[PDB]
Design a binder for this molecule. Structure first.
Ligand SMILES: N[C@@H](CCC(=O)N[C@@H](CS(=O)(=O)O)C(=O)NCC(=O)O)C(=O)O
Ligand SMILES: N[C@@H](CCC(=O)N[C@@H](CS(=O)(=O)O)C(=O)NCC(=O)O)C(=O)O
Lengths: 207, 207
């Protein structure tokens, strides 16, 4: 610690790590980058993009690398080696779908939305399946304790319910899971926050 | 162990993990899937895609989760928690470019090649820089020993020299890096093996 997140004024790729830190009782500083401060900041960013994260003397880029680091710092990475590998698997499945939603939103929202929405159940089904194989869907996506991939999947499922309000109809454990995890008191508090409610999900007005 | 890779007849998302295993003196079984056997196997794959990897009784999917699993299993994840964060970030930068190379190859090869090749220096310069900062570029991408991220970046660099043979000309540290790590005796023995040589880089004939 201390922690500082530098990012655009959107939820985007940082709302999962914000919920993690909130649920872990951490406080962090928000360095908001606007349209005017982005073109000069940009060339000093290693992969020329945001997020950027500072944790004491460590500066990190790449949102999943920031989640894996916080996962190691708070013991949110499985109870053993097999479990760590399964948490990585789920998080990459989350990242693949997060990538397709970003392409839809930012590049083909109007024409592609219905297509996207029609293929979506095949992309959500693997998570319903993991949840049924694990402790009756009553616990987390891997194991009996929360991992960084649960914050990232919770975020993904919540932005997709905005995109398509009935997308979890065929998936009961996924609907119960969104409800359960959203009611965790520090996450519930964060989701009610002005900071959370006042920023768009994405940076182009589409949602 | 034992290790079985199930995948299509290509280098694709499996050559980095094949090189890692060879360099580590491991043997593995190759289960090759074809156009005829893929449509029945596809519904049993968790995220409906290959590679699938078996390590004794652990079945994994997601190419980077498999590489992180092997990094954990073989001490190829940096010397401490800060280095592990850095290895994760490097590997995620490789995956972003790997996913753009796959879009060019599979959706836009002929029309996109020139624009892709023009933007490539900007996507390679992050790696050159990383190397500049690490023992003057004479070691690996993070620290003093190899990580799973070096296997993945080396594969990414080698398939980009096939795409555009002069791409590393402005990047002397990356150039030297490819030469150095490809000369590692077990990787060089792998790279000359018919098993490697006869496998196409991609599944559609483009390179
Ligand atoms: N792989 C990167 C992707 C980050 C990325 O795409 N960043 C975007 C912002 S956002 O889509 O995540 O909101 C960016 O900085 N874009 C500005 C630019 O490319 O100039 C990560 O996961 O951190
Ligand atoms: N995130 C997955 C991506 C795997 C993926 O794209 N798999 C392709 C094969 S390849 O492009 O990597 O060669 C596939 O299974 N395609 C068949 C299908 O989607 O039906 C990973 O990293 O492993």
């Amino acid at each position: 610690p201390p922690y500082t997140i530098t990012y655009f004024p959107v939820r985007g790729r940082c709302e999962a790590m914000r919920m993690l830190l909130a649920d872990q009782d951490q406080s962090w500083k928000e360095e908001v980058v606007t349209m005017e401060t982005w073109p000069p900041l940009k060339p000093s960013c290693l992969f020329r993009q945001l997020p950027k994260f500072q944790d004491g003397d460590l500066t990190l880029y790449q949102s999943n690398a920031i989640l894996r680091h916080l996962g190691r710092s708070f013991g949110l990475y499985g109870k053993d080696q097999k479990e760590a590998a399964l948490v990585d698997m789920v998080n990459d499945g989350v990242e693949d779908l997060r990538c397709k939603y970003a392409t839809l939103i930012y590049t083909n929202y109007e024409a592609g939305k219905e297509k996207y929405v029609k293929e979506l159940p095949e992309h959500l089904k693997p998570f319903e399946t993991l949840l049924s194989q694990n402790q009756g869907g009553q616990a987390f996506v891997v194991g009996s304790q929360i991992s960084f991939a649960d914050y990232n999947l919770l975020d993904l499922l919540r932005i997709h319910q905005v995109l398509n309000p009935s997308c979890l109809d065929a998936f009961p454990l996924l609907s119960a899971y969104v409800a359960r995890l959203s009611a965790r008191p520090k996450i519930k508090a964060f989701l009610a926050s002005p900071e959370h409610v006042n920023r768009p999900i994405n940076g182009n007005g589409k949602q």
